[PDB]
């Protein structure tokens, strides 16, 4: 159940890593794919789909991942760690990663 | 009297009454003025004494209970282990504690019934009445 997000989130051992967190809200057909810095309660990058998607909803999969990888690279965000909700890392969510992994 | 099941053996120590009101249940009561170990048979004496005096009613509240094992001298020894559980059961009674309280019987029908019970007790006592409102 809801235990899944807290399970995946807690296993993402925060400031011991040094690395930044990569949230994903793949629950709807509107993401948030945020880049959150562990230490300061602050969000650095982030790329959504609510305002303009070009018609796509589960197809925009790579686009929003590619958009974020580009959006981060501007600030110099190179080292990062991903965090799914209850998301099994397979389609809509696996794309966002594979598009960021290849997009820088 | 004795308890149903437990641990077997205990220990011993003392200081002023913890949980013992004055009223509740009955109208008149009996209060310990000295710290003691009230034997099971000691209470069973008081019950019987007060019981007889009232004849019919049984409106006697025994607030104390022998929740405590005491041990004894098999014959002499010392060379050997811990002692016999089965000597007696006791209720540790510190001054202020209500041991007994009576209902429905008159002022004198109680002054005397408690006076008799006192004579079966190892400690100084006193009779009590009303105006004890902490919780009800």
């Amino acid at each position: 159940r809801r235990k899944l997000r807290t399970r995946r989130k807690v296993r993402t051992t925060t400031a011991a890593s040094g690395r930044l967190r990569l949230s994903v809200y793949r629950s709807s057909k509107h993401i948030y794919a945020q880049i959150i810095d562990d230490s300061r309660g602050q969000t650095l990058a982030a790329a959504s789909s609510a305002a303009l998607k070009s018609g796509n909803k589960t197809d925009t999969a790579a686009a929003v991942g590619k958009a974020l990888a580009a959006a981060a690279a501007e600030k110099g965000i190179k080292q990062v760690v991903f965090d799914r909700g209850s998301y099994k890392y397979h389609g809509r969510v696996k794309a966002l990663a594979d598009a960021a992994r290849e997009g820088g | 009297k004795r308890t149903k099941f437990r641990k077997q053996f205990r220990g011993r120590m003392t200081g002023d009454a913890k949980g013992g009101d004055y009223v509740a249940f009955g109208d008149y009561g009996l209060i310990a003025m000295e710290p003691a170990w009230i034997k099971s048979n000691q209470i069973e004496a008081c019950r019987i004494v007060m019981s007889r005096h009232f004849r019919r009613g049984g409106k006697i509240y025994i607030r104390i209970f022998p929740d405590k094992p005491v041990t004894k001298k098999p014959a002499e020894t010392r060379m050997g282990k811990g002692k016999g559980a089965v000597e007696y059961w006791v209720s540790v009674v510190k001054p202020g504690r209500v041991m007994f309280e009576v209902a429905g019987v008159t002022e004198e029908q109680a002054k005397e019934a408690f006076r008799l019970a006192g004579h079966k007790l190892p400690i100084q006592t006193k009779m009590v009445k009303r105006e004890v409102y902490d919780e009800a």
């Binding site: 400031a15 011991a16 | 282990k81 811990g82």
Partner: protein, 84 residues
């Protein structure tokens, strides 16, 4: 050999050497490795820069200064806040 028990009931000599407790306290200059707590379960859970050994023992990862975090009671943490 008689029908009575090989093991005689009712004993008491039995007990054990036994140790434990907190080793480094709130506001102490630790070196790396220095044990901060010996415990059974997780009385204190590992905090920032503090490792947890197999037997729930809490050791320092980096030199610094010991800080204790008592989150309401039930969730306790030992962390290191370096002087550098």
């Amino acid at each position: 050999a008689h029908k009575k028990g090989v093991g005689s009931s009712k004993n008491g000599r039995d007990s054990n050497p036994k140790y434990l407790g907190v080793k480094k306290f709130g506001g102490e200059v630790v070196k790396a490795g220095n044990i901060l707590v010996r415990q059974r379960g997780t009385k204190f859970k590992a905090g920032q820069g503090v490792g947890m050994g197999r037997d729930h023992t809490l050791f320092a990862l980096s030199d610094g200064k010991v800080v204790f975090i008592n989150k309401g009671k039930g969730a306790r943490f030992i962390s290191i806040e370096a002087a550098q």
